[PDB]
Amino acid sequence: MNIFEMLRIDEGLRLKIYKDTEGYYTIGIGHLLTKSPSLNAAKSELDKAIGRNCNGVITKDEAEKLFNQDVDAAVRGILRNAKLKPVYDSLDAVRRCAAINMVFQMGETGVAGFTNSLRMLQQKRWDEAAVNLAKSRWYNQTPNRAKRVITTFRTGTWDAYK
Binding site membership for substrate: which residues? 32, 104, 117, 132
| DSSP-assigned letter for residue 30 | T
Report in angstroms how near the CB of residue 90 gets to ligand CCc1ccccc1 at its nearest. 8
Q: Does 145 bind Cl ion (CB under 5 A)?
A: yes
| The one-letter amino acid at 119 | R
By the 8 A CB rule, do 118 and 84 touch? yes
* Cα atoms in the 13 Å half-sphere on the side-chain side of 105: 24
**Binding status of residue 95 toward Cl ion by CB under 5 A:** no
CA distance 25 to 31: 9
Closer CB to ligand CCc1ccccc1, 46 or 112, in the complex: 112
The set of catalytic residues is 11, 20
Paired strand residues for 26: 18, 32
Residue 121 as a binder of ligand CCc1ccccc1 (CB under 6 A): the answer is yes
If one asks whether residue 138 binds ligand CCc1ccccc1 (CB under 6 A), the answer comes out as no
Least CB distance to Cl ion at residue 14 (A): 16
Q: Which lies closer to ligand CCc1ccccc1 via its Cβ, residue 44 or residue 136? A: 136
Question: Is residue 161 a contact partner of residue 129, using CB atoms and an 8 Å limit?
Answer: no
| Among positions 25, 88, 104, 138, the unique one binding ligand CCc1ccccc1 when judged by CB under 6 A | 88
Nearer to Cl ion, 95 or 145 (CB): 145
CB contact set of 92 (below 8 Å; sequence gap of 6+) = 156
